């Protein structure tokens, strides 16, 4: 008979968010799994123990990571799972590859799906991907991207410009636009990111995060989830990196779900293969729902923050994490149990005054008892000297699943309750808009 699966696994987290603890959270839940390394880390996993523990080491520059790399071929770590986008884009896959340590995520080659915005909507068009009308434009084409914006090409009359690299700009008016434009291809106010810039219709609608696994073959999606990107309540103010999640989104109904499954995710995967490059992972896929239906944003090829917080809390007791993990990195994800159990789930992002402006770091953490069913994922924590201080704008997210959304949203801010630090900020309308 073939040999017993490996039930003492080591797993190698790169990251330091939510996104990671609400992993690690869950992994270290696995049977199969013995030991489980953060790197770096934060104050979350740090205080998990057990077989959680933080790795203070450098990842080393691409295209080599060779100080990561290293460490892990001499700790034989039987996989590694890059929680933020630049590894991924910069190639971590393959520098794990070259040692033979398998890597949950996108080749570098795959991972440019959102590594370039200007490849990912020919891709999009290339595979009649439904996406706004858009042109590409490099750094050179200045003149191109004027006269463009001048003949008015969307219906809309608004347009987006957006650096293809690691951003995005809405010019309320043509004027803005213009601006918009050298700001980003002459003066570069975001670098090498600007190299090629996209510029796309503006369009109207709700937002929705899809997230899927992916083994090039097999897509199994997760429930959708609703983001909140805006740090004002009521969905105003500056933009953020995520203020809260809510999963599954009422929004996103049977046939809405259908569409974007067998107009977009499937078409995805097999495009990928198609195009040479299969697509193995986490697709993070967010959909804009317009009057006229599904539109893909962006494709985003790792799990997502603060969504992983909540879909986290979703997975059925009978879902093994880790087991999920290996089966799409060895291509067997349609073999393998994988369900989500009933109820909602919410996540709720306590962030430092100024987010997402200049904000101080180092204010000591009040953390207290939080009630039966919530669960805490620090993002922007550290540990020092016996003391959980902040270290980032997004703090943590207090999270917490129910059978019904009022409830599992109600159970979030009442561990809120429990935390409280100099200047925390979070917003009370999480999920509002779906009650």
Not at 301 to 319: H, K, S, Y
Request: charged share 20%.
């Amino acid at each position: 008979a073939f040999p017993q699966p490996k039930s003492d696994l080591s797993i190698l987290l790169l990251g330091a968010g939510g996104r990671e603890h609400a992993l690690a959270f869950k992994l270290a839940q696995s049977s199969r799994v013995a030991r489980i390394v953060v790197c770096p880390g934060n104050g979350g996993t740090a205080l998990m123990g057990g077989k959680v523990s933080n790795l203070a080491l450098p990842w080393g520059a691409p295209p080599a990571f060779r100080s990561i790399v290293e460490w892990a071929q001499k700790e034989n770590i039987d996989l590694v799972v890059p929680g933020p986008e630049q590894p991924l884009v910069d190639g971590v896959e393959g520098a794990f590859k070259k040692v033979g340590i398998p890597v949950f995520g996108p080749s570098p080659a795959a991972a440019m799906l959102e590594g370039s915005k200007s490849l990912s909507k020919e891709f999009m068009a290339r595979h009649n991907i439904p996406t706004a009308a858009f042109r590409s434009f490099t750094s050179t084409q200045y003149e191109d991207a004027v006269a463009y914006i001048k003949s008015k090409p969307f219906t809309s009359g608004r347009s987006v410009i957006k650096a293809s690299g690691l951003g995005v700009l809405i010019p309320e008016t043509d004027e803005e636009a213009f601006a918009a434009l050298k700001s980003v291809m002459v003066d570069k106010e975001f670098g090498d990111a600007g190299d090629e810039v996209v510029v796309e219709e503006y369009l109207s609608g709700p937002e929705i995060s899809v997230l899927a696994f992916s083994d090039g073959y097999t897509i199994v999606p997760m429930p959708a989830a609703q983001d909140h990107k805006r740090i004002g309540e009521g969905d105003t103010g500056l933009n953020t990196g995520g203020m809260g999640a809510y999963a599954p989104a009422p929004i996103a109904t049977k046939e809405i779900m259908e569409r974007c499954v067998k107009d977009v995710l499937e078409p995805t995967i097999k495009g990928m293969r198609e195009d040479g490059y299969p697509f193995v992972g986490m697709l993070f896929t967010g959909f804009m729902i317009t009057a006229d239906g599904p539109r893909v944003l962006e494709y985003n090829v790792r799990f997502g923050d603060p969504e992983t917080q909540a879909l986290m809390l979703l997975l059925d007791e009978q879902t093994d994490l880790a087991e999920v993990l290996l089966a799409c990195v060895e291509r067997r994800l349609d073999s393998i149990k994988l369900g989500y159990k009933q109820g909602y789930a919410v996540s709720v992002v306590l962030a430092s005054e100024g987010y997402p402006g200049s904000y101080p770091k180092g204010l000591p953490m009040t953390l207290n008892p939080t009630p039966e069913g919530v669960e805490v994922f620090h993002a922007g924590t550290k540990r020092s000297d016996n003391v959980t201080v902040t270290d980032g704008g997004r703090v943590l997210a207090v999270c917490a699943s129910a059978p019904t959304l009022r409830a599992a949203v109600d159970l979030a801010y009442s561990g809120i309750s429990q935390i409280s630090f100099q200047g925390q900020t979070f917003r009370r309308d999480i999920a509002y808009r779906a009650l």
